[PDB]
């Protein structure tokens, strides 16, 4: 599933045995209850441009 459309994950994806996958987020982010989206948890998360955010 992770190889197809990133498994639906906004960031990182792991496959598990069975019809199972888990999305994960980089440090400075947390995964939302949709199980796919990542939201910053700190002021300067990686890969975002403050003056544009």
């Amino acid at each position: 599933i992770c190889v197809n459309e990133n498994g639906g994950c906004e960031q990182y994806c792991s496959d598990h045995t069975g019809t199972k996958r888990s999305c994960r987020c980089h440090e400075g982010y947390s995964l939302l209850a949709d199980g796919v989206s990542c939201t910053p948890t700190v002021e300067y998360p990686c890969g975002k441009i403050p003056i544009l955010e």
């Binding site: 992770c2 990133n6 990182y12 994806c13 300067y44 990686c46 890969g47 003056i51």
Partner: peptide, 16 residues
């Protein structure tokens, strides 16, 4: 010190 002008780029996981 992270600021509006100093921010890291994300180092991605390999698979991603």
């Amino acid at each position: 010190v992270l600021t509006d002008h100093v921010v890291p780029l994300c180092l991605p996981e390999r698979t991603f």
